[PDB]
């Protein structure tokens, strides 16, 4: 394909399909897993939020996403919930790779925005009414605040900008192969971190 947006896509659909193995126990892993995640990609994000390999796709407002994880994560782990949620090694793995990318080389940060942001916006709606039900949860109105991008409208208008952004991106026949490469990167880092809250679950 032309664009770097629709060589992500099929790159991510041979990929999209594996680790179909896998409560409340288990939203609320989910849920601080997401955290660590986007504490250590908001925070690269940030830090290379004015280089050219990545201002395109810097929008903070409707992106952003740890204060959203924060409203959550007090009302499933309760006020003293930075002290008591979990950290665990796959946790850990993500957040050093999203590092050692934002840090040493920062074209590829674009992949994991792609990955952890599209992925999340278009799947939520999926994610969310389905695994909720099976939740049962009051009349409170916490807790699921991270599947709802309030300053985003059209989700489909937003994605189209996006991916616009992306083929913006002046990237050579090289970096456009690690860029896909770490996009992979990103599915295997997700894909084990869900088998290492499987092989926690059920022990």
């Known amino acids: 394909?032309?664009?770097?947006?629709?060589?992500?896509?099929?790159?991510?659909?041979?990929?999209?399909?594996?680790?179909?193995?896998?409560?409340?126990?288990?939203?609320?892993?989910?849920?601080?897993?997401?955290?660590?995640?986007?504490?250590?990609?908001?925070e690269e994000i940030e830090r290379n939020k004015e280089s050219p390999v990545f201002?395109?796709?810097?929008?903070?407002?409707?992106?952003?996403r740890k204060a959203a994880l924060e409203q959550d994560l007090a009302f499933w782990y309760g006020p003293r919930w930075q002290e008591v949620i979990p950290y665990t090694p796959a946790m850990q793995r993500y957040v050093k790779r999203l590092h050692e990318v934002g840090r040493?080389?920062?074209?590829?940060?674009?992949?994991?925005?792609?990955?952890?942001?599209?992925?999340?916006?278009?799947?939520?709606?999926?994610?969310?009414?389905?695994?909720?039900?099976?939740?049962?949860?009051?009349?409170?109105?916490?807790?699921?605040?991270?599947?709802?991008?309030?300053?985003?409208?059209?989700?489909?208008?937003?994605?189209?900008?996006?991916?616009?952004?992306?083929?913006?991106?002046?990237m050579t026949p090289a970096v456009r192969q690690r860029v896909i490469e770490e996009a992979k990167t990103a599915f295997l880092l997700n894909i084990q971190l869900f088998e290492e809250l499987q092989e926690l679950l059920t022990h």
């Open 104 to 170: 040493t080389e920062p074209e590829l940060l674009v992949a994991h925005a792609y990955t952890r942001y599209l992925g999340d916006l278009s799947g939520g709606q999926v994610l969310k009414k389905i695994a909720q039900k099976a939740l049962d949860l009051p009349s409170s109105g916490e807790g699921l605040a991270f599947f709802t991008f309030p300053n985003i409208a059209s989700a489909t208008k937003f994605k189209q900008l996006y991916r616009s952004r992306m083929n913006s991106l002046e």
């Open 1 to 42: 394909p032309q664009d770097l947006s629709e060589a992500l896509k099929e790159a991510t659909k041979e990929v999209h399909t594996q680790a179909e193995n896998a409560t409340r126990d288990g939203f609320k892993l989910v849920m601080a897993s997401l955290y660590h995640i986007y504490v250590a990609l908001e």
């Open 55 to 64: 201002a395109p796709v810097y929008f903070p407002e409707e992106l952003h």
